Amino acid sequence: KQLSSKFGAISSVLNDIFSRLDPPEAEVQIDRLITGRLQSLQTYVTQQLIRAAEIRASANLAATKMSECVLGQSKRVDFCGKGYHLMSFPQSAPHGVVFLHVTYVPAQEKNFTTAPAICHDGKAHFPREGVFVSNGTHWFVTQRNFYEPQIITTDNTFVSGNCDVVIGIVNNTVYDPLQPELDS
Amino acid sequence: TNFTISVTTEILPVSMTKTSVDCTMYICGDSTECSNLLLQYGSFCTQLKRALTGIAVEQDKNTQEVFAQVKQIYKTPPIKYFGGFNFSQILPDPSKPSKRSPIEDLLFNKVTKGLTVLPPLLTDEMIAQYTSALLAGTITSGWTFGAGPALQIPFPMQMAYRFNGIGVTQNVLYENQKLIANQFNSAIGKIQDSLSSTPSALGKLQDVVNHNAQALNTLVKQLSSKFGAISSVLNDIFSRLDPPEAEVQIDRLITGRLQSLQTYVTQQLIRAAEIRASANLAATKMSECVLGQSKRVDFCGKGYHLMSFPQSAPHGVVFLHVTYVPAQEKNFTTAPAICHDGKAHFPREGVFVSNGTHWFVTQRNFYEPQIITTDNTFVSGNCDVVIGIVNNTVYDPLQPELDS
Amino acid sequence: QGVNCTEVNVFQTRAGCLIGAEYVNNSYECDIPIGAGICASYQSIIAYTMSLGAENSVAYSNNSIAIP
Ligand SMILES: *[C@@H]1O[C@H](CO)[C@@H](O[C@@H]2O[C@H](CO)[C@@H](O)[C@H](O)[C@H]2NC(C)=O)[C@H](O)[C@H]1NC(C)=O
Ligand SMILES: *[C@@H]1O[C@H](CO)[C@@H](O[C@@H]2O[C@H](CO)[C@@H](O)[C@H](O)[C@H]2NC(C)=O)[C@H](O)[C@H]1NC(C)=O
Ligand SMILES: *[C@@H]1O[C@H](CO)[C@@H](O[C@@H]2O[C@H](CO)[C@@H](O)[C@H](O)[C@H]2NC(C)=O)[C@H](O)[C@H]1NC(C)=O
Ligand SMILES: *[C@@H]1O[C@H](CO)[C@@H](O[C@@H]2O[C@H](CO)[C@@H](O)[C@H](O)[C@H]2NC(C)=O)[C@H](O)[C@H]1NC(C)=O
Ligand SMILES: *[C@@H]1O[C@H](CO)[C@@H](O[C@@H]2O[C@H](CO)[C@@H](O)[C@H](O)[C@H]2NC(C)=O)[C@H](O)[C@H]1NC(C)=O
Ligand SMILES: *[C@@H]1O[C@H](CO)[C@@H](O[C@@H]2O[C@H](CO)[C@@H](O)[C@H](O)[C@H]2NC(C)=O)[C@H](O)[C@H]1NC(C)=O
Ligand SMILES: *[C@@H]1O[C@H](CO)[C@@H](O)[C@H](O)[C@H]1NC(C)=O
Ligand SMILES: *[C@@H]1O[C@H](CO)[C@@H](O)[C@H](O)[C@H]1NC(C)=O
Ligand SMILES: *[C@@H]1O[C@H](CO)[C@@H](O)[C@H](O)[C@H]1NC(C)=O
Ligand SMILES: *[C@@H]1O[C@H](CO)[C@@H](O)[C@H](O)[C@H]1NC(C)=O
Ligand SMILES: *[C@@H]1O[C@H](CO)[C@@H](O)[C@H](O)[C@H]1NC(C)=O
């Protein structure tokens, strides 16, 4: 559409200007036409450069995401997928890239009672990687992302100090297979 | 041997004021001959209108993406108890008519012819509500609301989870929970005093606003330029000069105004690209070290990062990063391993240290001496291939049970 | 935009008054954004305030945990 602009002249065709108007000022008219079209081309080139910068930033982000959570496992939260990311599938798209992300989504939560630690024999026991979970009568240990209750055992718990400095601790025994394996 | 809690302020711009410019009003105004003449230039005004609609929709898109990270609005419990911790400075004040916490109120107070300013779609009230919901989610659910449904969790349990994530055992938390809470409250008070006393803390948003105002004022002032004509007024030229050349003079004037407008649009587009880059950086920081724990070093906070509290700001966002900083170091003697009974023992997660006559295993970030046992150590090979090993016995936690 | 319509279904907003669309107290999911905390959508055409999301107040306690 920029070729259809008269730019203040009498015609949009330079051949018509050359064959229709006196050359001493047709030179000035052609100069005005070519400088207007050159300014339009400069504006279009600046717009193309801005779009190129945006596309380069987007492509760098896409390459970073592909290096992050396509070639390996990413520990980042909500970087390339909602929820706990697991992996993704790279796909080819026209002038773009589509990623089929696979994520881990917890569901079906259950109310439970928890304690900071367990005071047994005057000593405080803390879970190594889990947390103390009570279903109402007994205390169990499980991971923070799934419900796999287990008997309180010294293999997954460590002792550090007494229970008189901690706040909110409850009383429960700690099972140890040493006593039944040495009783017999 | 000791640790401290420090709060740092990070300011990242989000968006600027949306502007709409009309060519036929800014260049000449109410001139019918100018309106007839500008139709022969093509569709430059159409390109300008498309560019301003594009920058407006990009500003709306990034200001919607940077704040609406969750589709669920969470509310704080009426009881303001979190095991001794204080959050009254970040929690919204019900007494305020705008439901804004005093930190956001201080941040808002510290920021002060065709052209028009479009009001933002995301105004102050729902931005403040989004920040309050994010604070409630990160104070009552941890990282669970950012990875699915919100799950209730006590705040000391969340602190223990974060300390285990960064590499600190849970023993030092329950023994110093009151000290940690007091240090956090003191750091919050100190950073609030520093924010209230330093006017240069909000420099980025201030210079963005000043640059936008200067650009608008310069664009307004460029209308009164001669641009090679006899005068900057159009009607006196039209009614005084012979039209034949008066057309050339008005053409030069309107094309100079068009050049100035195109320069302004190009500068605005470059500033919009910079603002979009900053907003994308802020969104990545929000995804990394706001909705969950981030293991990156010196990304969104100096030292071992713990959590970040997002705060609303005029045309920007302010983050209150809380970090874990070790202090009060002590000299100790270390060994690569321990040669006991012809076997080399390597720690599973600790490091062997010595105070001069006894050896102990300690954590990588805190000093806590423990007796070297077989549960925290593993045996792999003999003790002669290694270099720098020393002599020490290994206490067996199982031997005295069957010794008696 | 930025023009008062009293000196040139009426609902006056900060950006300007809307003619042809009725204001609804109930808020739904926005379709066509307008600005100044208001927008219009087609259901006739109606306008409503922003819908941030479904309200979900979690029961926070010092000894309650939700294990998935
Ligand atoms: C909490 O869990 C424990 C163990 O999983 C439950 O104890 C068992 O309950 C079943 C159901 O009657 C009995 O048949 C078993 O004999 C119980 N085992 C023991 C060791 O007592 C307990 O009932 C659960 N409590 C609640 C409230 O669900
Ligand atoms: C947990 O158990 C300990 C001991 O097994 C309890 O401590 C005793 O408490 C009673 C009454 O409170 C005192 O008369 C005893 O002198 C305490 N003994 C010791 C060794 O301290 C403790 O009270 C229990 N806690 C709970 C919550 O049941
Ligand atoms: C670790 O540092 C903190 C402060 O940085 C110490 O806490 C101070 O303790 C002294 C006496 O023990 C009190 O008079 C101060 O008021 C405390 N300061 C604060 C801010 O609470 C703490 O004692 C240090 N720990 C060790 C083992 O030296
Ligand atoms: C948390 O901090 C706030 C202030 O940061 C405390 O509020 C102060 O309380 C004292 C005693 O009631 C008053 O003299 C001050 O005027 C209050 N300050 C403000 C700014 O209101 C508050 O007591 C702290 N603790 C809790 C649990 O909120
Ligand atoms: C290195 O630390 C150990 C552990 O605390 C010190 O051993 C104790 O020293 C005190 C007095 O210095 C004695 O009362 C204890 O009986 C010692 N513990 C044991 C198990 O024997 C040791 O003294 C420290 N070394 C130096 C040079 O200070
Ligand atoms: C740790 O102990 C081992 C054996 O208990 C040491 O190995 C002996 O070292 C002496 C002299 O240091 C030699 O005469 C022996 O021949 C070595 N025996 C073996 C089996 O290698 C070892 O040197 C000790 N470590 C240090 C640092 O002294
Ligand atoms: C747990 O209990 C609270 C109130 O006691 C309730 O609001 C919440 O819905 C319960 N959780 C589940 C999963 O039922
Ligand atoms: C939890 O808080 C309630 C009320 O504030 C209190 O009665 C109870 O003892 C607390 N429990 C723990 C474990 O701190
Ligand atoms: C440890 O020793 C070195 C040299 O012996 C000294 O420069 C340094 O200050 C000491 N560190 C502490 C914490 O005393
Ligand atoms: C440490 O270096 C010194 C000199 O470089 C050397 O004499 C000593 O044996 C070295 N110690 C170890 C444990 O490598
Ligand atoms: C428009 O003007 C009327 C009075 O002329 C006033 O009541 C109304 O608030 C104004 N509307 C806006 C959006 O300023």
PDB file of N, CA and C in Angstrom, chain B residues 51-119:
ATOM      1  N   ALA B  51       0.345   0.217  16.159  1.00  0.00           N
ATOM      2  CA  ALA B  51       1.471   0.125  17.087  1.00  0.00           C
ATOM      3  C   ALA B  51       1.057   0.470  18.514  1.00  0.00           C
ATOM      4  N   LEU B  52       0.224   1.501  18.687  1.00  0.00           N
ATOM      5  CA  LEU B  52      -0.215   1.857  20.037  1.00  0.00           C
ATOM      6  C   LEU B  52      -1.181   0.823  20.610  1.00  0.00           C
ATOM      7  N   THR B  53      -2.050   0.245  19.776  1.00  0.00           N
ATOM      8  CA  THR B  53      -2.895  -0.843  20.264  1.00  0.00           C
ATOM      9  C   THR B  53      -2.052  -2.055  20.643  1.00  0.00           C
ATOM     10  N   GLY B  54      -0.989  -2.320  19.876  1.00  0.00           N
ATOM     11  CA  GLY B  54      -0.095  -3.412  20.214  1.00  0.00           C
ATOM     12  C   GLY B  54       0.643  -3.193  21.521  1.00  0.00           C
ATOM     13  N   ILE B  55       1.171  -1.983  21.734  1.00  0.00           N
ATOM     14  CA  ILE B  55       1.886  -1.730  22.983  1.00  0.00           C
ATOM     15  C   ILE B  55       0.920  -1.756  24.167  1.00  0.00           C
ATOM     16  N   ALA B  56      -0.317  -1.279  23.980  1.00  0.00           N
ATOM     17  CA  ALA B  56      -1.308  -1.347  25.051  1.00  0.00           C
ATOM     18  C   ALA B  56      -1.652  -2.792  25.397  1.00  0.00           C
ATOM     19  N   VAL B  57      -1.851  -3.637  24.381  1.00  0.00           N
ATOM     20  CA  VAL B  57      -2.215  -5.021  24.662  1.00  0.00           C
ATOM     21  C   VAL B  57      -1.026  -5.795  25.230  1.00  0.00           C
ATOM     22  N   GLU B  58       0.209  -5.444  24.846  1.00  0.00           N
ATOM     23  CA  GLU B  58       1.368  -6.088  25.461  1.00  0.00           C
ATOM     24  C   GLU B  58       1.517  -5.684  26.922  1.00  0.00           C
ATOM     25  N   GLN B  59       1.287  -4.403  27.235  1.00  0.00           N
ATOM     26  CA  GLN B  59       1.322  -3.969  28.630  1.00  0.00           C
ATOM     27  C   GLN B  59       0.253  -4.674  29.452  1.00  0.00           C
ATOM     28  N   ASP B  60      -0.962  -4.787  28.903  1.00  0.00           N
ATOM     29  CA  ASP B  60      -2.029  -5.500  29.599  1.00  0.00           C
ATOM     30  C   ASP B  60      -1.676  -6.970  29.799  1.00  0.00           C
ATOM     31  N   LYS B  61      -1.101  -7.607  28.775  1.00  0.00           N
ATOM     32  CA  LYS B  61      -0.760  -9.023  28.863  1.00  0.00           C
ATOM     33  C   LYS B  61       0.311  -9.273  29.917  1.00  0.00           C
ATOM     34  N   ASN B  62       1.365  -8.448  29.937  1.00  0.00           N
ATOM     35  CA  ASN B  62       2.425  -8.696  30.910  1.00  0.00           C
ATOM     36  C   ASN B  62       1.996  -8.323  32.325  1.00  0.00           C
ATOM     37  N   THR B  63       1.177  -7.275  32.491  1.00  0.00           N
ATOM     38  CA  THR B  63       0.705  -6.955  33.833  1.00  0.00           C
ATOM     39  C   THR B  63      -0.354  -7.938  34.320  1.00  0.00           C
ATOM     40  N   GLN B  64      -1.007  -8.669  33.412  1.00  0.00           N
ATOM     41  CA  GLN B  64      -1.890  -9.750  33.834  1.00  0.00           C
ATOM     42  C   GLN B  64      -1.105 -11.012  34.169  1.00  0.00           C
ATOM     43  N   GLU B  65      -0.040 -11.290  33.413  1.00  0.00           N
ATOM     44  CA  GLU B  65       0.739 -12.504  33.633  1.00  0.00           C
ATOM     45  C   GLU B  65       1.625 -12.403  34.868  1.00  0.00           C
ATOM     46  N   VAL B  66       2.143 -11.211  35.177  1.00  0.00           N
ATOM     47  CA  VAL B  66       3.088 -11.082  36.282  1.00  0.00           C
ATOM     48  C   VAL B  66       2.394 -11.177  37.639  1.00  0.00           C
ATOM     49  N   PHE B  67       1.089 -10.920  37.704  1.00  0.00           N
ATOM     50  CA  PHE B  67       0.366 -10.881  38.970  1.00  0.00           C
ATOM     51  C   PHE B  67      -0.613 -12.030  39.152  1.00  0.00           C
ATOM     52  N   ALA B  68      -1.370 -12.388  38.116  1.00  0.00           N
ATOM     53  CA  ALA B  68      -2.381 -13.442  38.225  1.00  0.00           C
ATOM     54  C   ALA B  68      -1.740 -14.806  37.960  1.00  0.00           C
ATOM     55  N   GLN B  69      -0.837 -15.183  38.868  1.00  0.00           N
ATOM     56  CA  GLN B  69      -0.182 -16.481  38.781  1.00  0.00           C
ATOM     57  C   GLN B  69      -1.044 -17.611  39.329  1.00  0.00           C
ATOM     58  N   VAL B  70      -2.075 -17.292  40.110  1.00  0.00           N
ATOM     59  CA  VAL B  70      -2.977 -18.286  40.673  1.00  0.00           C
ATOM     60  C   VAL B  70      -4.412 -17.848  40.420  1.00  0.00           C
ATOM     61  N   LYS B  71      -5.288 -18.829  40.214  1.00  0.00           N
ATOM     62  CA  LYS B  71      -6.701 -18.577  39.971  1.00  0.00           C
ATOM     63  C   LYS B  71      -7.551 -18.694  41.229  1.00  0.00           C
ATOM     64  N   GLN B  72      -6.939 -18.951  42.382  1.00  0.00           N
ATOM     65  CA  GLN B  72      -7.650 -19.084  43.646  1.00  0.00           C
ATOM     66  C   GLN B  72      -7.215 -17.971  44.587  1.00  0.00           C
ATOM     67  N   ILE B  73      -8.186 -17.304  45.199  1.00  0.00           N
ATOM     68  CA  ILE B  73      -7.932 -16.219  46.140  1.00  0.00           C
ATOM     69  C   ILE B  73      -8.001 -16.800  47.546  1.00  0.00           C
ATOM     70  N   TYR B  74      -6.892 -16.723  48.273  1.00  0.00           N
ATOM     71  CA  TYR B  74      -6.808 -17.234  49.631  1.00  0.00           C
ATOM     72  C   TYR B  74      -6.873 -16.086  50.631  1.00  0.00           C
ATOM     73  N   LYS B  75      -7.448 -16.373  51.796  1.00  0.00           N
ATOM     74  CA  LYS B  75      -7.623 -15.389  52.854  1.00  0.00           C
ATOM     75  C   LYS B  75      -6.896 -15.849  54.108  1.00  0.00           C
ATOM     76  N   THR B  76      -6.249 -14.903  54.785  1.00  0.00           N
ATOM     77  CA  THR B  76      -5.540 -15.214  56.013  1.00  0.00           C
ATOM     78  C   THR B  76      -6.531 -15.571  57.124  1.00  0.00           C
ATOM     79  N   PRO B  77      -6.146 -16.469  58.036  1.00  0.00           N
ATOM     80  CA  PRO B  77      -7.018 -16.771  59.169  1.00  0.00           C
ATOM     81  C   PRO B  77      -7.148 -15.569  60.086  1.00  0.00           C
ATOM     82  N   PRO B  78      -8.279 -15.431  60.786  1.00  0.00           N
ATOM     83  CA  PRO B  78      -8.438 -14.292  61.708  1.00  0.00           C
ATOM     84  C   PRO B  78      -7.431 -14.279  62.844  1.00  0.00           C
ATOM     85  N   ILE B  79      -6.982 -15.443  63.302  1.00  0.00           N
ATOM     86  CA  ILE B  79      -5.981 -15.514  64.362  1.00  0.00           C
ATOM     87  C   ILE B  79      -4.609 -15.263  63.750  1.00  0.00           C
ATOM     88  N   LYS B  80      -3.930 -14.226  64.229  1.00  0.00           N
ATOM     89  CA  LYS B  80      -2.613 -13.852  63.711  1.00  0.00           C
ATOM     90  C   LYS B  80      -1.506 -14.451  64.578  1.00  0.00           C
ATOM     91  N   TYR B  81      -1.452 -15.780  64.588  1.00  0.00           N
ATOM     92  CA  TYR B  81      -0.445 -16.525  65.331  1.00  0.00           C
ATOM     93  C   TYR B  81       0.280 -17.467  64.382  1.00  0.00           C
ATOM     94  N   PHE B  82       1.606 -17.356  64.340  1.00  0.00           N
ATOM     95  CA  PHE B  82       2.438 -18.195  63.483  1.00  0.00           C
ATOM     96  C   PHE B  82       3.663 -18.676  64.245  1.00  0.00           C
ATOM     97  N   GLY B  83       3.467 -19.096  65.490  1.00  0.00           N
ATOM     98  CA  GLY B  83       4.567 -19.556  66.321  1.00  0.00           C
ATOM     99  C   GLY B  83       5.557 -18.479  66.707  1.00  0.00           C
ATOM    100  N   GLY B  84       5.071 -17.282  67.034  1.00  0.00           N
ATOM    101  CA  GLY B  84       5.918 -16.187  67.448  1.00  0.00           C
ATOM    102  C   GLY B  84       6.327 -15.237  66.343  1.00  0.00           C
ATOM    103  N   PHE B  85       6.184 -15.638  65.083  1.00  0.00           N
ATOM    104  CA  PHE B  85       6.540 -14.768  63.972  1.00  0.00           C
ATOM    105  C   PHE B  85       5.510 -13.655  63.807  1.00  0.00           C
ATOM    106  N   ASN B  86       5.977 -12.508  63.320  1.00  0.00           N
ATOM    107  CA  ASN B  86       5.140 -11.332  63.118  1.00  0.00           C
ATOM    108  C   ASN B  86       5.068 -11.013  61.632  1.00  0.00           C
ATOM    109  N   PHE B  87       3.851 -10.767  61.137  1.00  0.00           N
ATOM    110  CA  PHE B  87       3.636 -10.427  59.734  1.00  0.00           C
ATOM    111  C   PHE B  87       2.681  -9.249  59.572  1.00  0.00           C
ATOM    112  N   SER B  88       2.550  -8.400  60.594  1.00  0.00           N
ATOM    113  CA  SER B  88       1.618  -7.281  60.525  1.00  0.00           C
ATOM    114  C   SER B  88       2.030  -6.236  59.496  1.00  0.00           C
ATOM    115  N   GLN B  89       3.317  -6.168  59.149  1.00  0.00           N
ATOM    116  CA  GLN B  89       3.773  -5.184  58.175  1.00  0.00           C
ATOM    117  C   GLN B  89       3.400  -5.564  56.748  1.00  0.00           C
ATOM    118  N   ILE B  90       3.297  -6.858  56.449  1.00  0.00           N
ATOM    119  CA  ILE B  90       3.022  -7.306  55.088  1.00  0.00           C
ATOM    120  C   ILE B  90       1.549  -7.666  54.937  1.00  0.00           C
ATOM    121  N   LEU B  91       0.915  -8.087  56.030  1.00  0.00           N
ATOM    122  CA  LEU B  91      -0.503  -8.403  55.985  1.00  0.00           C
ATOM    123  C   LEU B  91      -1.326  -7.124  55.831  1.00  0.00           C
ATOM    124  N   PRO B  92      -2.375  -7.158  55.010  1.00  0.00           N
ATOM    125  CA  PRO B  92      -3.174  -5.949  54.776  1.00  0.00           C
ATOM    126  C   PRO B  92      -3.881  -5.472  56.036  1.00  0.00           C
ATOM    127  N   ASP B  93      -4.016  -4.152  56.140  1.00  0.00           N
ATOM    128  CA  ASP B  93      -4.642  -3.534  57.300  1.00  0.00           C
ATOM    129  C   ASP B  93      -6.134  -3.369  57.052  1.00  0.00           C
ATOM    130  N   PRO B  94      -7.003  -3.980  57.864  1.00  0.00           N
ATOM    131  CA  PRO B  94      -8.450  -3.769  57.682  1.00  0.00           C
ATOM    132  C   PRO B  94      -8.889  -2.331  57.901  1.00  0.00           C
ATOM    133  N   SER B  95      -8.141  -1.554  58.689  1.00  0.00           N
ATOM    134  CA  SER B  95      -8.504  -0.163  58.934  1.00  0.00           C
ATOM    135  C   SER B  95      -8.296   0.717  57.709  1.00  0.00           C
ATOM    136  N   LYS B  96      -7.404   0.331  56.804  1.00  0.00           N
ATOM    137  CA  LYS B  96      -7.172   1.117  55.599  1.00  0.00           C
ATOM    138  C   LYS B  96      -8.370   0.999  54.663  1.00  0.00           C
ATOM    139  N   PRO B  97      -8.863   2.109  54.105  1.00  0.00           N
ATOM    140  CA  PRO B  97      -9.995   2.022  53.165  1.00  0.00           C
ATOM    141  C   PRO B  97      -9.682   1.236  51.904  1.00  0.00           C
ATOM    142  N   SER B  98      -8.432   1.250  51.449  1.00  0.00           N
ATOM    143  CA  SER B  98      -8.031   0.536  50.245  1.00  0.00           C
ATOM    144  C   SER B  98      -7.587  -0.894  50.521  1.00  0.00           C
ATOM    145  N   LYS B  99      -7.676  -1.347  51.777  1.00  0.00           N
ATOM    146  CA  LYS B  99      -7.245  -2.687  52.194  1.00  0.00           C
ATOM    147  C   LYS B  99      -5.785  -2.945  51.827  1.00  0.00           C
ATOM    148  N   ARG B 100      -4.935  -1.951  52.067  1.00  0.00           N
ATOM    149  CA  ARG B 100      -3.521  -2.023  51.740  1.00  0.00           C
ATOM    150  C   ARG B 100      -2.687  -2.039  53.015  1.00  0.00           C
ATOM    151  N   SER B 101      -1.696  -2.925  53.049  1.00  0.00           N
ATOM    152  CA  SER B 101      -0.760  -2.965  54.159  1.00  0.00           C
ATOM    153  C   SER B 101       0.095  -1.697  54.162  1.00  0.00           C
ATOM    154  N   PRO B 102       0.570  -1.263  55.338  1.00  0.00           N
ATOM    155  CA  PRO B 102       1.339  -0.006  55.403  1.00  0.00           C
ATOM    156  C   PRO B 102       2.606   0.014  54.559  1.00  0.00           C
ATOM    157  N   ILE B 103       3.198  -1.142  54.251  1.00  0.00           N
ATOM    158  CA  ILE B 103       4.365  -1.163  53.368  1.00  0.00           C
ATOM    159  C   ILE B 103       3.978  -0.708  51.964  1.00  0.00           C
ATOM    160  N   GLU B 104       2.877  -1.251  51.435  1.00  0.00           N
ATOM    161  CA  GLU B 104       2.392  -0.818  50.127  1.00  0.00           C
ATOM    162  C   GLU B 104       1.924   0.632  50.158  1.00  0.00           C
ATOM    163  N   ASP B 105       1.365   1.075  51.288  1.00  0.00           N
ATOM    164  CA  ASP B 105       0.974   2.476  51.416  1.00  0.00           C
ATOM    165  C   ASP B 105       2.190   3.395  51.360  1.00  0.00           C
ATOM    166  N   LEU B 106       3.278   3.008  52.031  1.00  0.00           N
ATOM    167  CA  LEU B 106       4.511   3.786  51.972  1.00  0.00           C
ATOM    168  C   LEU B 106       5.098   3.781  50.565  1.00  0.00           C
ATOM    169  N   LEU B 107       5.046   2.632  49.884  1.00  0.00           N
ATOM    170  CA  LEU B 107       5.545   2.556  48.513  1.00  0.00           C
ATOM    171  C   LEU B 107       4.730   3.441  47.576  1.00  0.00           C
ATOM    172  N   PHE B 108       3.409   3.482  47.769  1.00  0.00           N
ATOM    173  CA  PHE B 108       2.562   4.346  46.954  1.00  0.00           C
ATOM    174  C   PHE B 108       2.809   5.818  47.263  1.00  0.00           C
ATOM    175  N   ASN B 109       3.047   6.147  48.535  1.00  0.00           N
ATOM    176  CA  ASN B 109       3.297   7.536  48.907  1.00  0.00           C
ATOM    177  C   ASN B 109       4.656   8.019  48.417  1.00  0.00           C
ATOM    178  N   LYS B 110       5.645   7.127  48.337  1.00  0.00           N
ATOM    179  CA  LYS B 110       6.973   7.510  47.876  1.00  0.00           C
ATOM    180  C   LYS B 110       7.056   7.691  46.365  1.00  0.00           C
ATOM    181  N   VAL B 111       6.018   7.316  45.622  1.00  0.00           N
ATOM    182  CA  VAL B 111       5.980   7.469  44.172  1.00  0.00           C
ATOM    183  C   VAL B 111       4.957   8.545  43.840  1.00  0.00           C
ATOM    184  N   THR B 112       5.393   9.570  43.115  1.00  0.00           N
ATOM    185  CA  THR B 112       4.510  10.664  42.726  1.00  0.00           C
ATOM    186  C   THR B 112       4.356  10.730  41.210  1.00  0.00           C
ATOM    187  N   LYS B 113      -5.135  17.446  23.719  1.00  0.00           N
ATOM    188  CA  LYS B 113      -4.646  17.684  22.367  1.00  0.00           C
ATOM    189  C   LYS B 113      -4.284  16.371  21.684  1.00  0.00           C
ATOM    190  N   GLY B 114      -5.219  15.427  21.694  1.00  0.00           N
ATOM    191  CA  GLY B 114      -5.020  14.111  21.108  1.00  0.00           C
ATOM    192  C   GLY B 114      -4.396  13.095  22.042  1.00  0.00           C
ATOM    193  N   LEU B 115      -3.359  13.498  22.772  1.00  0.00           N
ATOM    194  CA  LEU B 115      -2.709  12.599  23.715  1.00  0.00           C
ATOM    195  C   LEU B 115      -3.610  12.337  24.914  1.00  0.00           C
ATOM    196  N   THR B 116      -3.676  11.074  25.327  1.00  0.00           N
ATOM    197  CA  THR B 116      -4.483  10.681  26.472  1.00  0.00           C
ATOM    198  C   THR B 116      -3.831   9.483  27.146  1.00  0.00           C
ATOM    199  N   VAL B 117      -4.186   9.276  28.411  1.00  0.00           N
ATOM    200  CA  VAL B 117      -3.638   8.194  29.222  1.00  0.00           C
ATOM    201  C   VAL B 117      -4.746   7.180  29.471  1.00  0.00           C
ATOM    202  N   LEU B 118      -4.549   5.962  28.983  1.00  0.00           N
ATOM    203  CA  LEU B 118      -5.517   4.896  29.210  1.00  0.00           C
ATOM    204  C   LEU B 118      -5.370   4.357  30.628  1.00  0.00           C
ATOM    205  N   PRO B 119      -6.444   4.309  31.411  1.00  0.00           N
ATOM    206  CA  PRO B 119      -6.375   3.676  32.733  1.00  0.00           C
ATOM    207  C   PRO B 119      -6.076   2.194  32.605  1.00  0.00           C
TER     208      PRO B 119
END
